[PDB]
Design a protein around this ligand. Structure first.
Ligand SMILES: Nc1ncnc2c1ncn2[C@@H]1O[C@H](COP(=O)(O)OP(=O)(O)OP(=O)(O)O)[C@@H](O)[C@H]1O
Ligand SMILES: Nc1ncnc2c1ncn2[C@@H]1O[C@H](COP(=O)(O)OP(=O)(O)OP(=O)(O)O)[C@@H](O)[C@H]1O
Ligand SMILES: Nc1ncnc2c1ncn2[C@@H]1O[C@H](COP(=O)(O)OP(=O)(O)O)[C@@H](O)[C@H]1O
Ligand SMILES: [Mg+2]
Ligand SMILES: [Mg+2]
Ligand SMILES: [Mg+2]
Lengths: 55, 470, 485, 485
């Protein structure tokens, strides 16, 4: 009887874990954008600064 | 003699501008000389800005150049010594002896710059090359007369690796070898020169079977960008004129691009993506094309590649893959575990990885080992989140094996004996395949994992497992 | 003269700026005193920027240069077949002078909106995982995108070899001439690639446009267009030609180099704005001409190399946007054993069944389903037997269906040999068989049919369809072999 | 007229375009009418680019300029010992003129390939975590990379303090002179550092070179190079030297400033193309010389400042590639109580045991390997599952070894005091002791030997190795103490 109570709790434990971990993914995935865009803009700045070189 | 005089007009870093007279301009890729009290500062033509002005690249320290010193046109690209005369001697980029052995008596002087062999001259081979390293001979075996690449971040084991190859191929090779140090620790050369004497490869009062070309990192951007060519030229000679097997060791090849990357900005080149110069693919190309086997002679090349920030997406490493037949990628994630040489079994591939080359039996055993190590890495998310007990009977049995094979790939090198304390061990390919085969069949599921860590032949595994039990 | 001639003002970086030629055309070729040729891409009021096809060591200051009055042109026609030429179109194999039936400009305008037809002629690659899952069509632009050392060339390479089934035949509207475009590859590789097609008798209908890495940048720039025309020839004359660009990634790098050295505006990742106009003006050249135009067709299989699966990069995004489907390949899938590692999940084809044999379509419509549900329930396979029977059934199929797609290299199979394997897989006649013997199953099964049910195979090859009679006859022959097994 | 003189055309931001000077050399020192000196880096026909060592509010258009005729050099010799000089080598401590024996240039060629010796001489850093895991060797360059406020300087500083054990001696070949190179730091800090050295009578064998932030960019740039020449001196006269750069990260920023201002095109993140060549021709200058040369040597402890723990950065990677290993320091380990926070996982020494003391080499063989297993077990016990005897045994010891490595700043420990502690650790005599006890255990155990078993400490010290007899006594001395209390 106390085995049927573990599975029941463990079924709830991993349910919220998937919800938190899952929702955590929708948060880091946003940080992956701003960080992707940052690298694209930064690499672009050196390219422009190397060409804007005059006297 | 009828030399062409010139005069320096600008000096910026490793970039020197000379102003010649009309009708007296030297073509691109021509050497120049400027007399100094200390020595000679060779220059190399790069561009023609116009108005009788040429831009060169300082082959040495630019400090001490006076606005308008008279430069002497060499009349041709940098000349390096060739022939068996260069055997057993150390040579810099300019082709001058730097071992205190007096002048190098060469019958010929061939320019460092030359065109790549013709598509017609290209000769394909399928012969295999036996080194003695299990993880290699079993997975990605090197080809005789082929191009090898040793990829790896900083402190992974690229040097020790290439050093062992010399301790197992060079003596065992009835031909000639050429080592070229490009952008590395001057001290590593020293130890090398010392070992070549002690092994017997280089004899000061006798015969030698290898030449030495160094253009280390202490040298300016000019030198490190052409030292690779200097040593290539000496190899190529034994290739066509001598018509015999030759071992070319380059370390490191990444400095070739980098060095050029430093000066590209000063030569008025708009920096390409990642800061590298636009002329990356071509330069990296005009070097690898020359390093190859023709119908005149065979050349086995072992080039160690550096990986900036352990990033393989970097242009420098990325471009180099296409110029290699056998690639031996080293992962830092493998070093940290203590398993060495930190060779990545999945990412490392080879050309001779074919049944019709290494044998049918050899291919199957190699493929099984790869699939085992893959599933292992695939279950890494379960072995930490659910334990080992949750795995199935087929899984646990595989996992254990994957751990044994993994540790079984490690091998003690006689070169890094000072690091491991264990005497080097050279395993034969014929025994190597027979070893894993046996382990794949489960014939040693009783033996402990620690009995496969840092072990040569399969016999030693059983011997070790028995010595521990005592 | 000053109008037909010019003086070199400055030379370097494989680009020399000349003064004069006040009547020179855009992108026109020119010839220097030394012998090396080049083409002017930039036409400035004062000077003219001209790229080099050879070392800049030959070109000096003040040197004289004269016009050629001709734009980049390459000789086309059926004489090239079995030869190996460079970007310009000269011989490099040493088999003598080429016999072309005319020339065509490197730059040709793509067929208009009206002179085309919906692709309907399948391009059998001989790859089970391809012809079953991602069907390719004559005139389609299917992209072979994937990381390094994944099996991108394998896909194309097998395709070419799988053409001996029709090219050695008599009918022309059935054949398919193959044009491979080596860009940025070392000579050693090309010499081998060629040597493989020969040991298989494929050079008989293959054209190699080699553009080694040591060659000047512009060569690697013109290679794809050069080869493009060569194949269009076949297309215009009412035939079928398959051209594989391996790889466009290297081409862009070359072009970037020229553009930067010429001091043109640098964009994302140092690529000029016209980089997209480059590939779009290349891929759109391949299509399916209508009945009035000649019903001719030109298929394109462009190859793109990603850096760690990053399909979001600049170049890849451009190519993927233009093509009509991808054959995404992953190294990981390769390690597991699944070879060729064609990620069914990503690999797609916009044309689809439109260009696939109905004989295989009748057994492939469902194969995309099972595999689809298999990728979803793939995590369960790692857990104990506590899995219900419903999901378990999926695992039984997937393991086996995935094991069937595994096809050795250099071993293409005709449709007549694919259908029998797919039909036995879909219904589930292998579920009872061990997942270790699936390999030998294909061998012994094919040999069986070719000795006892040869009449069935030959009817599928000719008709190309499966009638209710065959569906029953094929099932009976299968259940018989599975039984005796 | 203008051959030896020149008139200023423009001036600002520490840069001065002077006209004339058609006989000045490359990188030659010059003097303006104001009194302020300068350095010529850009040689052009029109004008000469010069960088100022001082403020530029004094230079004005049309001012006279004179040349020195000599390359920027600095005074060298024993005299500097205990003195605090600046880039140029002038006294800034206020204790009289610098009595130098010779003068050497700033830029000196690295020692030859022929005149070298493999590193075999240890460098007692007094840090157990260091001398046990990543030993230093006379002639190598051990990096000290880490974020701000971690303990980079600490490692270096303690080293100098530890040298007092031999510098007060009579033997020369055993001593080790120290050269601290403050770059980018504020005068406040430098003052406090030099104060601390004196509080330990460590200033007498120490030379300090100051290049505070306030000074001109060219000073911060030249500081390390001149400072190196100072140390090279001992290396040549058959003595041993120990230079510490702190930090090259600032030096590159400085050198970046001259480039940008001299209108020199930037590479990545504005750093000059040859930024690598900045640290390469610096670190290579330190190495072990041949017996013919004097058996002299120069050790280097470069310091770098990462941002957010990002070692993948531009400058750091440039230096990691040159240095013979690195002592990674993590902020996170510092709070956890690991002080000094040396990450063994990432800290390595390329010279390895060759440099380590022979005695200490025996007691700790696979210790680094064991600490690797500890982190392996420590991460796996995170699951919250029970552990067997094996995984808990190593977990017990591995946890205490990490606690034994913790050592307080300003507290260098001799070799005779490190061996015993490590001995009792690797074996397993601490396993049966509580964690918060390891602390006082160290001090108590030492006091025990210094009182009773002092003979052994004297043998380990002189011999430097462990004999069959010495192990016996040492074994019994350990067990006897464990029984006590
Ligand atoms: N279908 C296959 N069956 C077995 N082996 C294969 C198959 N396809 C590829 N290989 C293996 O792949 C290797 C080369 O792969 P491939 O040339 O297809 O990748 P690629 O796209 O050309 O990568 P790269 O860009 O490096 O050329 C060979 O060593 C060969 O063993
Ligand atoms: N071994 C140690 N034990 C305890 N605290 C320490 C130790 N070493 C250094 N610290 C503390 O860390 C702080 C900063 O140390 P340290 O000066 O070594 O950092 P740093 O690397 O020099 O940073 P910065 O370069 O900014 O000066 C000091 O306040 C000091 O008290
Ligand atoms: N066979 C080996 N076993 C264990 N460690 C090794 C082995 N070979 C090299 N190493 C480690 O790698 C270090 C040297 O790295 P190196 O070969 O210079 O790498 P890189 O090519 O990245 O500079 C040595 O200090 C040693 O610790
Ligand atoms: Mg190395
Ligand atoms: Mg390919
Ligand atoms: Mg500090």
């Amino acid at each position: 009887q106390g085995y049927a109570a573990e599975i029941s709790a463990r079924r709830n434990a991993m349910d919220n874990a998937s919800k938190n971990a899952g929702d955590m993914i929708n948060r880091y995935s946003i940080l992956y954008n701003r960080t992707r865009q940052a690298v694209i803009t930064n690499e672009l700045v050196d390219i422009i600064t190397g060409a804007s070189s005059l006297g | 003699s009828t030399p062409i005089t010139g005069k320096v007009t600008a000096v910026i870093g490793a970039i020197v501008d000379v102003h010649f007279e009309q009708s007296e301009l030297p073509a691109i890729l021509n050497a120049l000389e400027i007399k100094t009290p200390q020595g000679k500062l060779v220059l190399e033509v790069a561009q023609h800005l116009g108005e009788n002005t040429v831009r060169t690249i300082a082959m040495d320290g630019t400090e001490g150049l006076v606005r308008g010193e008279k430069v002497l046109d060499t009349g041709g690209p940098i000349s390096v010594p060739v022939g068996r005369e260069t055997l057993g001697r150390i040579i810099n980029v300019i082709g001058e002896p730097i071992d205190e052995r007096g002048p190098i008596k060469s019958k010929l002087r061939k320019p460092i710059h030359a065109d790549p062999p013709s598509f017609a001259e290209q000769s394909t081979s399928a012969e295999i090359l036996e080194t003695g390293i299990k993880v290699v001979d079993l997975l990605a075996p090197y080809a005789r007369g082929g191009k090898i690449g040793l990829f790896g971040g900083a402190g992974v084991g690229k040097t020790v690796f290439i050093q062992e190859l010399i301790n197992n191929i060079a003596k065992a090779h009835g031909g000639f070898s050429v080592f070229t140090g490009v952008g590395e620790r001057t001290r590593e050369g020293n130890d090398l020169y010392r070992e070549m004497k002690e092994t017997g490869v280089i004899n000061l009062e006798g015969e030698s079977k290898v030449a030495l070309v160094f253009g280390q990192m202490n040298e300016p951007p000019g030198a490190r960008a052409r030292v690779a060519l200097t040593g290539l030229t000496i190899a190529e000679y034994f290739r066509d004129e001598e018509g015999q097997d030759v071992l070319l060791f380059i370390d490191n090849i990444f400095r070739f691009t980098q060095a050029g990357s430093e000066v590209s900005a000063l030569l008025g080149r708009i920096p390409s993506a990642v800061g590298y110069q636009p002329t990356l693919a071509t330069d990296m190309g005009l070097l690898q094309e020359r390093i190859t086997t023709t119908k005149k002679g065979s050349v086995t090349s072992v080039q160690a590649v550096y990986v900036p920030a352990d990033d393989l997406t970097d242009p420098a490493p990325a471009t180099t893959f296409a110029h290699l037949d056998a690639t031996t990628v080293l992962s830092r994630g493998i070093s940290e575990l203590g398993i060495y040489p930190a060779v990545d079994p999945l990412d490392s591939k080879s050309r001779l990885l074919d049944a019709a080359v290494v044998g049918q039996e050899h291919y199957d055993v190699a493929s099984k080992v790869q699939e085992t190590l893959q599933t292992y890495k695939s279950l890494q998310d379960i072995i930490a989140i659910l334990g080992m007990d949750e795995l199935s009977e087929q899984d646990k049995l595989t996992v254990e094996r994957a751990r044994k094979i993994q540790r079984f790939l490690s091998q003690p090198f006689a070169v890094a004996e000072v690091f491991t304390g264990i005497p080097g061990k050279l395993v034969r390919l014929k025994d190597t395949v027979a070893s894993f085969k046996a382990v794949l069949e489960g014939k040693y599921d009783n033996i402990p994992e620690h009995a496969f860590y840092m072990v040569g032949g399969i016999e030693d595994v059983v011997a070790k497992a028995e010595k521990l039990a005592a | 003269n000053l109008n037909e001639t010019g003086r070199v003002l400055a030379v370097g970086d494989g680009i020399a700026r000349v003064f004069g030629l006040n009547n020179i055309q855009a992108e026109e070729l020119v010839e220097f005193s030394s012998g090396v040729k080049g083409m002017a891409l930039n036409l400035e009021p004062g000077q003219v920027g001209i790229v080099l096809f050879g070392s800049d060591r030959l070109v000096k200051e003040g040197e004289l240069v004269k016009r050629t009055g001709n734009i980049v042109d390459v000789p086309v026609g059926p004489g090239l077949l079995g030869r190996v030429v460079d970007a310009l179109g000269n011989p490099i194999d040493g088999k003598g002078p080429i016999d072309a039936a005319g020339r065509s400009r490197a730059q040709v305008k793509a067929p208009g909106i009206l002179p085309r037809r919906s692709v309907h002629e399948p391009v059998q690659t001989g790859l089970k995982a391809v012809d079953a899952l991602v069907p390719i069509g004559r005139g389609q632009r299917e992209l072979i995108i994937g990381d390094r050392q994944t099996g991108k060339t394998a896909v194309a390479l097998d395709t070419i070899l799988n053409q001996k089934r029709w090219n050695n035949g008599s009918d022309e509207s059935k054949k398919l001439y193959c044009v491979y475009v080596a860009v940025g590859q070392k000579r050693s590789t090309v010499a081998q690639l060629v040597q493989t097609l020969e040991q298989h008798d494929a050079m008989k209908y293959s054209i190699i446009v080699a553009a080694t890495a040591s060659e000047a940048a512009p060569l690697q720039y013109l290679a794809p267009f050069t080869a493009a025309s060569i194949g269009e020839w076949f297309r215009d004359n009412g035939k079928h030609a398959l051209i594989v660009y391996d790889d466009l990634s290297k081409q862009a790098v070359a072009y970037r180099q020229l553009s930067l050295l010429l001091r043109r505006p640098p964009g994302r990742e140092a690529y000029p704005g016209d980089v997209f106009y480059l590939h779009s003006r290349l891929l759109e050249r391949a299509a399916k001409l209508s009945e009035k135009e000649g019903s001719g067709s030109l298929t394109a299989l462009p190859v793109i190399e990603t850096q760690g699966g990053d399909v979001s990069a600049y170049i890849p995004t451009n190519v993927i946007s233009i093509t009509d489907g991808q054959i995404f390949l992953e190294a990981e899938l390769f390690y597991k054993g699944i070879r060729p590692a064609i990620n069914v999940g990503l690999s797609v084809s916009r044309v689809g069944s439109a260009a696939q044999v109905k004989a295989l379509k009748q057994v492939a419509g469902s194969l995309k389903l099972f595999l689809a549900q298999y990728r979803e329930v793939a995590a369960f396979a790692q857990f104990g037997s506590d899995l219900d029977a419903s999901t378990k059934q999926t695992l039984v199929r997937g393991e086996r269906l995935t094991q069937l797609l595994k096809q050795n290299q250099y071993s293409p199979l005709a449709t007549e040999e694919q259908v029998p394997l797919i039909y036995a897989g879909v219904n589930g006649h292998l579920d009872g068989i061990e997942l270790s013997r699936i390999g030998e199953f294909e061998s012994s099964f094919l040999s069986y049919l070719k000795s006892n049910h040869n009449e069935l195979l030959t009817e599928i090859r000719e008709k190309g369809e499966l009638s209710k009679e065959l569906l029953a006859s094929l099932k009976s022959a299968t259940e018989s072999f599975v039984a005796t097994f």
